[PDB]
Design a protein around this ligand. Structure first.
Ligand SMILES: [Zn+2]
Ligand SMILES: [Zn+2]
Ligand SMILES: [Zn+2]
Ligand SMILES: [Zn+2]
Lengths: 306, 306
């Protein structure tokens, strides 16, 4: 049992943020995607003749079990076609938990909805890097050995706003054991003294992407843990350094001066231009001249029935 | 002569924002990409033995001539291979103006630098749309007829932060005459009573992209006007509606109430979680455990020379 702590797993972030214990309808959950995830399981149980308590119990079970996003593979856990077709065929972010009446693994299908899932923002040092190394931290709340990990990244055409995570949209970037090490005082994990920690080069994406992490136990039970992690790279602002022409080193003089550890925790207006007023009228232009409901003729054409 | 007013052309936005007349080194330009564009032409002239005035004159000529981002094609303006190889082979956003000593068309190469160019933000009604109609507005400051337009969009793999706009990264989405019509009171154009206005379905992009607009005169001179326009679609926040399970219409009662024109112009904290303090420590985690300078051993390992 466990979950990704860095980058924080989707279901882990929803659990830690809370507000899901009361009210029972999930209206206290501040994140809209964690709220929509809760409310989808809640609403689904109600549709199937469940009571408010059975609906709230199934939705709360999905959030509470953030360390048990699991599926049993049996003794044939190394068979790729067995995992992709029988163990986790779909509902990848839920680890194929689709039965609210049967626990384990209940119904965690709320976690596979598409939309604006909050990501870990990784800033780029330079916008030209091909890969960014990240030190993955997997938090085991229960210690299980022997075990191995598989880390996947979504293909560049995956869209988190509209797409379900599928095996056909995932690229394997890691496979093998991850050594069990001592947590650092820094650790995002607080279950025991140990973590799974490793550097993985993450291929750069110009869009929000998903990192799929499978933690498989090498045993006849074949229990595997599957987690979705939402990530995004922040681009560095300014000119690309390689395009920047530098001035020659000069020394100048004249009576017109205009002619020549810790870190820090409207501006575009000039003496010859008012950006605030211009950008407000330009925002209005965007609204009325883009989309299926844009102004075409009504502000210029008058008609009557003859 | 003219420039795109909607979506605002790259060189038009830099000109309107101002701050480029004084100081002569361009330090008064508020937008970093307009400033880097100015300073690249300024610095280039200085490197070639130009004086501060010849450097400031060439950089100011690039900004001032926002309606003359032009190239002469000659009588064979319909020959695609003549345009892509001889007329505008490179420096597409500058309309291949590479000579500061010779006017027209001077040096406008500052406009082809890569980086965080400010885009027109177009909000999506739904994140599942394939195309978004926009009403293009081309502002003619000089009226020229007969003439035609070609509108291009960049390929999905184009990256504005690092890539030069090339013909190999552009997809033609419009070709033909655009009727000359009366400006609307709404108009972003203020040169004369007329504009070029048309609806074009813009293919959806999940990243910042460029719209390349070529306004060609049908005449033996074959003067063409070429403009880059930076654009981005804003995604709608929340759950994708198609994934949303709705509750059944119910009527409830009990003593615990928790159980059941014009428009408008920290929040994620709950009674059971402090997000502000958690998200500050998590931002610090990102900084120290991502990138080539992340902490690996130094906070845990002590060494000495024997
Ligand atoms: Zn376990
Ligand atoms: Zn420092
Ligand atoms: Zn003209
Ligand atoms: Zn309204």
């Amino acid at each position: 049992h466990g979950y990704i702590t860095f980058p924080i797993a989707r279901q882990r972030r929803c659990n830690v943020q809370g507000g899901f214990w009361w009210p029972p309808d999930g209206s206290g959950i501040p994140d809209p995607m964690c709220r929509a995830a809760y409310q989808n399981v809640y609403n689904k149980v109600l549709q199937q003749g469940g009571t408010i308590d059975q609906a709230a119990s199934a939705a709360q079970y999905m959030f509470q079990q953030d360390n048990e996003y699991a599926a049993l593979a049996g003794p044939n856990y190394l068979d790729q076609n067995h995992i992709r077709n029988n163990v986790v065929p779909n509902y990848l972010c839920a680890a194929h938990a689709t039965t609210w009446r049967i626990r384990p693994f209940g119904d965690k299908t709320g976690m596979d909805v598409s939309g604006s899932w909050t990501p870990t923002v990784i800033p780029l040092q330079d916008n030209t890097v091909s890969t960014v190394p990240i030190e993955f931290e997997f938090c085991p709340t229960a210690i299980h050995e022997p075990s191995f990990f598989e880390i996947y990244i979504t293909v560049p055409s995956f869209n988190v706003y509209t797409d379900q995570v599928t095996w056909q949209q995932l690229i394997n970037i890691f496979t093998g054991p991850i050594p069990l090490v001592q947590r650092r005082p820094d650790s995002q994990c607080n279950a025991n003294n140990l973590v799974y920690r490793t550097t993985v080069g993450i291929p750069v994406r110009q869009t929000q992407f998903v990192l799929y992490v499978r933690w498989q136990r090498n045993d006849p039970v074949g229990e595997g843990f599957y987690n979705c992690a939402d990530v995004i790279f922040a681009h560095r602002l300014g000119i690309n350094e390689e395009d920047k022409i530098r001035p020659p080193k000069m020394k100048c003089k004249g009576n017109d001066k205009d002619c020549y550890h810790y870190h820090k925790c409207r501006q575009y207006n000039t003496k010859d231009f008012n950006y605030v007023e211009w950008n407000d009228d330009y925002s209005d232009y965007i609204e009325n001249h883009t989309g299926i409901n844009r102004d075409m003729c009504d502000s210029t054409t008058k008609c009557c029935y003859k």
